[PDB]
Symmetry: D2
Subunit: 365 residues, 4 copies
Amino acid sequence: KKIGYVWDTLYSWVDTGTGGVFAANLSKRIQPITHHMNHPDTKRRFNELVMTSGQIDFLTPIKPYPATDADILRVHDKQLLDNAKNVSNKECGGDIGDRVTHLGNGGIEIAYLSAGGAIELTKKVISGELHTGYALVSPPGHHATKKDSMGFCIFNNTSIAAAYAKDILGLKRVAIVDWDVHHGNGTQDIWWEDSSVLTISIHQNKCFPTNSGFINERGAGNGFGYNLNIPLPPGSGNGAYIYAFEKVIVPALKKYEPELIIVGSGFDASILDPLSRMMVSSEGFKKMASLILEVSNEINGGKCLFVQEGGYSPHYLPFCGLAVIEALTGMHTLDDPLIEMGGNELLPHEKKVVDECANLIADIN
Amino acid sequence: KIGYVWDTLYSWVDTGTGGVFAANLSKRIQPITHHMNHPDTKRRFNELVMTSGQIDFLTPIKPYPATDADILRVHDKQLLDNAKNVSNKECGGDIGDRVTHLGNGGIEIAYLSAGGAIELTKKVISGELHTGYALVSPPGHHATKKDSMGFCIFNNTSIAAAYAKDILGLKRVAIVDWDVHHGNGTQDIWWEDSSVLTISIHQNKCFPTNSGFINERGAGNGFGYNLNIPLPPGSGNGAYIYAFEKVIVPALKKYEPELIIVGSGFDASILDPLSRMMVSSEGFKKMASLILEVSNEINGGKCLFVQEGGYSPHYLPFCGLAVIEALTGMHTLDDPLIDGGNELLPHEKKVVDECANLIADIN
Amino acid sequence: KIGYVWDTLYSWVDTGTGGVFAANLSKRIQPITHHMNHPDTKRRFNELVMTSGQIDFLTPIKPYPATDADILRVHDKQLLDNAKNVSNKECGGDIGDRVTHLGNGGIEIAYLSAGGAIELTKKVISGELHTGYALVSPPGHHATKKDSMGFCIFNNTSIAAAYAKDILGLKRVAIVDWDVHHGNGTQDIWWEDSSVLTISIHQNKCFPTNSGFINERGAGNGFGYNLNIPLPPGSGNGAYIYAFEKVIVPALKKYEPELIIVGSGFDASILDPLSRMMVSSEGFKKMASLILEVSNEINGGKCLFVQEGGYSPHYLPFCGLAVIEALTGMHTLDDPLIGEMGGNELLPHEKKVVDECANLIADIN
Amino acid sequence: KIGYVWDTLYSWVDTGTGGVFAANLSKRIQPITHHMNHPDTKRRFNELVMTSGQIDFLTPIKPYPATDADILRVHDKQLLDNAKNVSNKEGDIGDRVTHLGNGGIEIAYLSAGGAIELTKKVISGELHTGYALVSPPGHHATKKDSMGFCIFNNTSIAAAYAKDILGLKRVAIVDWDVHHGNGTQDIWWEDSSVLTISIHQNKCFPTNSGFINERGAGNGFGYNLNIPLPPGSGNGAYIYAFEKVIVPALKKYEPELIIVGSGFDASILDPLSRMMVSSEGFKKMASLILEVSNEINGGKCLFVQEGGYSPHYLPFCGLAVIEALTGMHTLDDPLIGGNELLPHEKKVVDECANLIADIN
Ligand SMILES: [Cl-]
Ligand SMILES: [Cl-]
Ligand SMILES: [Cl-]
Ligand SMILES: [Cl-]
Ligand SMILES: [K+]
Ligand SMILES: [K+]
Ligand SMILES: [K+]
Ligand SMILES: [K+]
Ligand SMILES: [K+]
Ligand SMILES: [K+]
Ligand SMILES: [K+]
Ligand SMILES: [K+]
Ligand SMILES: [Zn+2]
Ligand SMILES: [Zn+2]
Ligand SMILES: [Zn+2]
Ligand SMILES: [Zn+2]
């Protein structure tokens, strides 16, 4: 099996000097800090461990190419794009919309290459050039709506790829399965009225955004019943996550019969991530990818692919990400340095949410 | 009259080696520049105290080093000898647990850390101060009688309690530790002793993974005088406040300690990487206010707060400031992220209530 | 009685977004976390003052903001207003020289910096203190009447000079700048004024590249009362001390100022990236000592030191500490680099420059 | 066809402990997050080769570990044994400033093997030239001792390989790192089969070696040439040194391989020198080397990374050398001094040109 791997040095050049929840603000006494949350070193360490662990030998490198305006404009409005162009034009950079999201001088080039990364991987998976793959792209995508960039996301990478698989490669049912610890409100908005894209987001209840991602947000029109949120409570771990994957997401995908599954693969649900209270360990992420690999092999011949979302622990993210790479290559080259107390047992209030979400599968056809 | 202990040397801890993710080429753990226990976190706290204007309400206390005699009231010579040996190596070295590291001459800072808790204790018992905050480093609550571990060389609060007992003649002392990790060192040091009541509220099963459960109540004459509240992952201000009101405050009232020492960690904060708790800065203020309140009711406001863990350089300074503000009565700066876990949940309540039964055995 | 001016806000300057190497994707200047003017350099100076015991021989002096009036004695209203413009912006901005940057609310640090030089000046002039050191930040000596530049928003030493004259009644002040770069701002501010003798010893043609020559000597009432000493790249203790003993001290003796103000930068040190000078800590100590001595000989010891530039986080603390030991007399601690790396001999082409400058003394009256 | 050697592991060197400014509470040297030899400096260089598009003109070359035998062609067993011992621990290796993390010998092996891989492909004709962006550096290690961030003398290891395995009889090592290549000088001191040239800042490091009178011994008298430039020297002194000493020494000796020890610590922003070389000075130095390489041995020269300590400016100095080899200039120096040739500088180069007479 050829397993694609999308990486480019530019992904590690996102400018995070300004911006963020804790931007320097002398008036409010927020002291300048050296390492901001979305500092590029977290995903760079992931890439660098892929190299030095030998997993790269089982992988086929895939060079990304810039997405075009037309690729972006299939899901995003011209207002959003021209805004990102004009902010990226300024010297020193600029806020983009929600204050937290920063676009540096010329930063749009990285957003273009990031989105094209997801498209290159898609093109190679649907053609048969590759059985699956991992696109370690940055900046992330899943918070960008039809109208707005937010949450570090300029463009909705996975949605741009799903619209590419549909509008150019002729697919008719796609599923975007997003396990980033925050709700994928961007993806949910883009496909809100559309049943040709099943969108699923499992996430921490009320984390980001604080007012979206609830069970009863289900789509509308032709889209009703083709958006599914699993909002787990803080503290959930491998127990809750695997239970959710087995009772809800895998039966949901079996029902919908997608011809391509795109995983929004974030790792901010990790046990050490500063922007969650979830307890997923790297082996949990391994079992998560395998379940998705497996059901994909059952139905659409392994046509699935993983695209990086968030993740903020420079220490532990590389091993979470490497664990998912191993589930694609089936070679174990290296142990988790934390190879196990907390989060592995399924708690009844964690179960009460997943049982509720399992009833939603009946409305998928 | 509110003391504040700080010294520049507390921010000179060398954190280049060690950590759970200490560089290891064979295991492919890449060197990183910012380890978890980097000095920037507690340095940003002390600088916010300065630039928020709180310092105008605070009486600075210069710390002096603890003696060997002060460390030996609670630690075995083996522990102290070990730290002198490692502190002597030219490059420093691992203290024993392959996580804690002590730089060359780093024992100087460990003495100063403990002495800072002793200077605050001296001045509060004597009446020179009403209460205070000692922002010391390295922290203490994981050091047992025999073993340094978890970034702790010396058990600062225990050294302070022992000093208050054996030198200042106190008979009854309580240590209240709200660091998110079980204070296993304090538990071990006073296991057999009813004259220091030890209470740890912490995340169930975080660190160390083999301690902190309800059934660890002490031994011998000390049975009933160690109390653990292990909250579930995800607990926030509602479980913590509820725990302080149904367990910790009734317990102190019953025990009637001549002095309360709080081990003030902030790694239970909503943003800390080493916890899954959701306490906010407002949450920490109330917890502090409740200890003052109970301290003013039963022993004459004789309480003080001694820094333990905390690893979020963005949000810890505001959690520390909120505790300082609860000591001064003066609000001077808003928490910038306060725009959650404020609702108490059945499974958090069930732990807290099971713990309230244990108050009966405190006499 | 030795004053020491420090404040935590001096280490809170926002420097993650600007400078010669500001992030520019188009030019492929990759984002970096430590810029040249990072506050850790001067913070480590202050912390070494604390941890060495020198603080026990010093009188801490608390700074208060300079007013607009203090700033306007030497700067055009456009400069002051342009500082408020940039400072109020969310996330700051370029002050208008593509190198200098003002954080959000950062004008408050600018005010407190000039305030720190005023407060030491007041306390020294009034006899309350004999001398002192103001470890202020940002530096000042590049700011002209019209323009902020080179990390300097306000000319701190010139604002303290103008305060001593127009409020405390002094008629003769001398500003001696040993920052490795030319004090173009001090020279410009007092170009036409003889009541402020301005001396700058610098690296010939570093920053600005178009000033600092011997033939710049003032105009009007000010002719002969500006003195530039442009030493060659490579100069160290041998040339710096010869320049002090043959030009700067004789010029001060001839001038008989009521107060001597030292712009004390440490960027001429052997390890500083932004110069090619080889001064060591013992050189900076002797330089401070010579000023102290001529000042105790003529104007009753009325001199003080205001921090300017310096960019070696490893070595600046010991250079700055060495200057304090000249003030306090107390040797607490040894320079951990004592040396044979060069510069202690006075080379011929270095004397050629100093000797020329010594002729300019004849026109100081 | 131009080779480029890089491996992710070269940026995994552990620079947390050690250094001339290693933390020391009794000397009150405060711990610092960024030491002088931090991997970021050479990682940025590599990442600029990627993002500038120079990589599209380059042939990537995977490095392979030098073997113990490779090391022992030029180093004593004690040096090698000392490194395995220090590497097995969870330490300092020789001169206090050189530090080797646990298992760090793996990277030193990979560093020397990188300079061997480039050398093989350049001799074989598979490549015309190339650049080996290896770490840790090498030119300070002698037969007996590692020192100055240098575990193994990479360029000397590659020169021994080119001779014993590949059959070359004359090799030249040109070292333009700002510090004296005392290691290389020591390894080939009695040997005329390796012309060793070092241009460095007079008395910088080590403070006690690098002088003109140090010309070799025995068979090797006349085949070691030191050019010790005065502090403050720049593009002027350096280009005059190359046109008037280094190139003519190389034309006279006629080596079959030129190995450049390529350091950028002579650059205008480096904290560890007082030299004023700019990115165009390095490009010009590289170009003179290629020019004489094509005139006298068919373009058989290669560049091996030594020192350099400015994360901001080093990447553009290294890009400038890559641009020289590729002939494709796709990016400007954002900073673009000592372009003038000073008499005390010329006095040094002039005395050195006299030395070319004893090269045969
Ligand atoms: Cl942030
Ligand atoms: Cl760590
Ligand atoms: Cl910069
Ligand atoms: Cl260093
Ligand atoms: K999600
Ligand atoms: K949908
Ligand atoms: K007890
Ligand atoms: K605790
Ligand atoms: K003047
Ligand atoms: K100057
Ligand atoms: K050299
Ligand atoms: K030789
Ligand atoms: Zn996220
Ligand atoms: Zn802790
Ligand atoms: Zn300067
Ligand atoms: Zn070097």
